[PDB]
Structure formats: structure tokens, C-alpha cells
Amino acid sequence: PEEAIRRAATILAEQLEAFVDLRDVRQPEVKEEKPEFDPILLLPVDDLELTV
DNA sequence: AATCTATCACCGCAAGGGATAAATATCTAACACCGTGCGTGTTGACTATTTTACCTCTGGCGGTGATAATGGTTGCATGTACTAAGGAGGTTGT
């Protein structure tokens, strides 16, 4: 389950035609985000640049 | 505990979205002034703060009435189911 997740769950990209613009009408509304910056002592191990 | 090939995919690395912070412009608030009026001060006359004195409230409680009145109240403990004990007394027995 440490492999069988990171595209195995994003199959959600195949369950969303029912709900998030069913048609052809993307509208002006945002994504409104989360930033925390380099090189803060709290930053994830991914901020060493990794390998699969 | 090292090796990797061969998974399912994260990175490989192009694009672009929001963000925030700069500059501007607006807002308000903090203040310093002024003016008001109140609680700044002593003095003085008031009248009723307190005390004691006096004259005379409220409520302390002790005292007990007499034409005569002279057989009383009191209602439901409980109705069941048990059974252990004591109580009775005549008698046929110990």
C-alpha cells in the first residue's frame, strides 16, 4: 500500500464528469493555496530532490 | 546485506495561477485645545448625627374567667401465602 496509492487513488480523475463542469463552462473562481517557503526547518524531505 | 530491472508512476522541468507588497489614497483616531459644570475649598447657619436626660410608647408575660354547661369517641391494621411457635385441655397413654 506504500506503492499502490499515488496514481492508484487519482483514479478520482475518472469520477468527476458528474460534478465539476459537467459540460463546457469553467467559471472565474480560484484555487486559493498554502505556501511555506525554502529553506525553512519545517519543510518536507522532498525539498532535497528525490528518486521515484 | 548487497545487486538490479522493470514496475507504477514522480519527477522532468513547461507552463501559469495567486499572491502580497509596493504605492497610493482613503479612512479614523488621538490628541490639544477650549468650555462647561461639578463636587475644588472654607465658612457659616441650619436642623435634627448622636448622646443623655426626662416623660411617658410598645410589648414583655403573668395571670386565670362562673345563670350553667359532669357516659366519651374512633373508624378501618386486614382479608393473601406461607408456616413456625405458643397456647389450650381432655385423655390415653409414658
Measured CA to CA, the distance from residue A2 to residue A36 in angstroms comes to: 26
Phi, then psi, of A35 in degrees rounded to 5:
-60, 145
CB-CB neighbours of A52 under 10 Å: 4
Is A38:A47 a contact under the CB 8 Å cutoff?
yes
Q: 3-state DSSP call for residue A47? A: coil
CA distance linking residue A52 with residue A43, whole number of Å: 19
- Kindly list the distances between the CA atom of residue A5 and the CA atoms of A9, A21, A47, A50, in Å, as whole numbers in the listed order: 5, 26, 21, 18
- Measure the CA angle with vertex A49, ends A44 and A52; round to 5°: 100
**A7: nt with nearest C1' to CA:** B9
* Ramachandran assignment for A35, one of left (phi > 0), alpha (psi -120 to 50 degrees), beta (any other): beta
**Bases of strand B lying below 7 A from some protein CB:** 7-11, 13, 17-19
- Amino acid at site A16: L
